[PDB]
Each structure stands twice: as C-alpha cells, then as structure tokens.
Design a protein around this ligand. Structure first.
Ligand SMILES: Cc1nc2c(c(C)c(C)n2Cc2cnn(C)c2)c(-c2ccc(Cl)cc2)c1[C@H](OC(C)(C)C)C(=O)O
Ligand SMILES: Cc1nc2c(c(C)c(C)n2Cc2cnn(C)c2)c(-c2ccc(Cl)cc2)c1[C@H](OC(C)(C)C)C(=O)O
Ligand SMILES: [Mg+2]
Ligand SMILES: [Mg+2]
Lengths: 147, 151, 57, 58
C-alpha cells in the first residue's frame, strides 16, 4: 500500500506529459517528456523509484509501459508492474491547475511543475487538514516504524 | 531546518550534473542537465520544491544560481536564497559519496544520466553504518514527518 | 506586495530585475526599477507572482 | 538475480526479459519463452536486481 503508484500519459499543446500518482495519498509527480517512448518512461521510473519507495506500478497496455526498457528498470529497482480511477480523478485536478497557472509560464513544462507544486502543497480545508505532500510523508513514515 | 537544501553543479564525462542535498538528512537529488544555466537550474528548483518542502537553498555565487530565472523561481515558490560569502561544504561530503557510487555502477548503464539516477537510488536507500541502521531516504521522511506534527 | 517583474532594456539580451509592476497593458508594461519609470513592451516583460508561496503557507 | 535483453541478428526490436543460463567470455546463453539462444556480449544488455538488493521490502 505505501508503494502503490499509478502511471499514465496525457497530452497538452502537442506535448507528452507523464503522470505518476501515489494512490494512497493523491500525491503526484508529473513532467513533460520529449517523446512517449519506453526509453523516456524508464528514465522517469528510475528517478521516481530513487526518491520514493516504489513497490508496484499500475499502468495501461501502452507500448511505452510494456517496453523492455521499463521492464528492465522495474527488475533493477525491484518494482512489480500491474496492467489491470484515482489517476484520472487526480489528473483532472492537474489539468485544472495547469489551466489556472498557464499564463504565468512561457513553456508548458514550467506550468506543469507549477501545477504539481500547487497540487501537492494545497491543504485540505477543515479541521486537521493536510496536503497530499504531507499525506505521503506520513504514510511512508508510519510504514518505516512498523519494520 | 527541515527545508534547508544545498545545491551545486558537478561535472562528469563533459556533462553537467546538478546536485541538491537535504542538509539535515544527507538525502540527495541529482540529474544531468543539458547546460549549466539558470534556466535549467530554475526548472530543476521548481521540480524539487514541488516534491519536498524547500524553504532555503544554500548555493555558491555561480552564474546559474545567481541568475534572474532562479531568483524568480524562488520568489514564486517562496524559497529563501542564501548565497555563500565569496572566498569561502556539507554537500561535498555527500557529493564525494555520489561520485563513488556512480563509478561503481557506471558499467550498468549506457548513458551517464542513467548511472546518476542509479547512484541516487543506491545512495538514498543505503543504510548508514550497516543493515541495522537507517538510510537517507528514511531520515528525510522522519525529519519531515515529525516536523509536520509540530504545527 | 506580490509581484516582481523581469525585463530587457534596449537590445541587451540579459534580463534585468526584479522591478515593481505598475500596469500590464495590452502590448506594453509599465514598471519602475529603483526610482526609474520604464515602459517595456509586453514581449520584453516577464511578470512573476509569489503564487506558490500564497498556496503553501 | 539476472535478466538479459538482446537483439537477434539484423533485428532492431529488443527481446526479453530472457532468463540467463551462463555467461562466456563474449557471449551469453539465455532462454526466451523456452527457446535457448546464444547471443554475443555486444548485442546484450544484462540487468541485475542491483537496486532491489539495496532495498529490503516487499
Ligand atoms: C523560459 C523562461 N525564461 C525566463 C524566465 C524568467 C523569470 C526570465 C527572466 N526568463 C528569461 C531568461 C532566460 N534565460 N535567462 C537567464 C533569463 C522564466 C521563469 C518563469 C517563471 C518562473 Cl517562477 C521562473 C522562471 C522562464 C520559464 O522557464 C523556466 C524553465 C522555468 C526557466 C517559463 O516557462 O516561463
Ligand atoms: C539507453 C538504454 N537502452 C536500453 C536499455 C535496455 C534495458 C534496453 C533493451 N535498451 C535498448 C532499448 C532502447 N529503447 N528500447 C525500446 C530498447 C536501457 C536500460 C539499462 C538499465 C536499466 Cl535498469 C533500464 C534500462 C538503457 C538505459 O537508458 C535509459 C534512459 C534508462 C532507458 C541506459 O542508459 O543504459
Ligand atoms: Mg495511457
Ligand atoms: Mg558551484
């Protein structure tokens, strides 16, 4: 549960955005990639797995996610792949924020990182509200203590 | 204190590696950037600030770190910049171990940027002292988690 | 204050800033950099808000 | 502990993951879907779970 991620590709302004969502927290990481290829997807995964404890990734049957480069990265990093709606709901919120801040950036990739920033740090409103960035840190912290 | 980061640029095989180290934990984030410019540094910073609480960045007076693009990114993300005093290294301690791991796994990757991300992986998961110790990735999570509980 | 402007003067390619915003017109931006009023085309002006700071804490 | 990816002769599509059987001086013996092949060391990318060994969790 602490290491379950959903990955998918979305498209804006002719560019390819690779999105990773931590399922249990809603925390997201996203970046424009130069092409929707397995080579770029694998490099994305190696970065992600070196920063968060990635144990399982859920993707569709896209060619980039079934590539030999991605399967090798998952073998090297110890990631289990699963090709069987949190990402769609969270990505709809990412597209919402990208449109909010689009005029603040020249390049789309800059707006994407601005939107990722806002998404992960925006606290929930009421009593005891926390952000997605705070939720994933808490989830990983408690899993480490229960060694 | 939990949001203190040190950033510096290092070079390998003719390429520019931008390194960010979380001071309180030794957790590092590194990536090959196409040029040692403020434009690439600023994009690196916005990515980092969206992932971790980055409140203060310690850098030297390199042109990329003193650039207008970097200062604009810190103003947008609310990051305080702390440039070093000219004429004079905690990042060097972790950067020395970074180059050591890059050389250990360099043959495992065709591109240097892949070897760099492999080294970041191993550095952040390596338990300090031994199997009975903790890693940099666990230390930064513990530091941030307990800091969240304060407020 | 929440706005900081970066701009280019003349054909000097290096960007100057931060300057204070006064009005973002259609094809021109009015700024003041250290008691010096300047009128810069919208193309040569980049306005940066502390938007991420206002959405974090 | 070891997986190998390879290309057959004059075939640009990479094959794998193949199960490594033995490693020679400049060649490896691997098994891809119950088919055993001998691929040169030049056209072979050998990937071990090096990162998985430094990460103890499942
Ligand atoms: C393309 C770009 N050029 C910029 C700036 C700024 C402030 C200046 C003056 N310039 C001109 C320039 C180019 N080199 N130098 C030395 C000066 C920014 C920017 C916009 C918003 C934030 Cl918070 C931070 C930076 C960007 C952004 O791209 C990244 C990848 C982020 C750099 C973008 O997409 O708008
Ligand atoms: C350049 C490269 N090509 C690779 C692989 C693999 C396994 C194959 C078969 N190929 C040929 C290929 C290229 N596209 N496709 C569709 C097949 C890897 C690799 C090496 C180690 C790990 Cl753990 C993971 C991937 C890389 C690495 O680069 C990244 C950026 C990581 C992809 C690198 O730098 O070695
Ligand atoms: Mg898809
Ligand atoms: Mg330096």
């Amino acid at each position: 549960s602490p290491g379950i991620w959903q990955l998918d590709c979305t498209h804006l302004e002719g560019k390819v955005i690779l999105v990773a969502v931590h399922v249990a927290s809603g925390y997201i990481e996203a970046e424009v990639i130069p092409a929707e290829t397995g080579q770029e997807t694998a490099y994305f995964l190696l970065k992600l797995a070196g920063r968060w404890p990635v144990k399982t990734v859920h993707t569709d049957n896209g060619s980039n996610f079934t590539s030999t480069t991605v399967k090798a990265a998952c073998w090297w990093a110890g990631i289990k792949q699963e090709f069987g709606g949190v990402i769609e709901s969270m990505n709809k919120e990412l597209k919402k924020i990208i449109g909010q801040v689009r005029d603040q950036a020249e390049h789309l990739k800059t707006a994407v990182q601005m939107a990722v920033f806002i998404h992960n740090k925006k606290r929930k409103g009421g009593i005891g509200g926390y952000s997605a960035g705070e939720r994933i840190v808490d989830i990983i912290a408690t899993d480490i203590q229960t060694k």
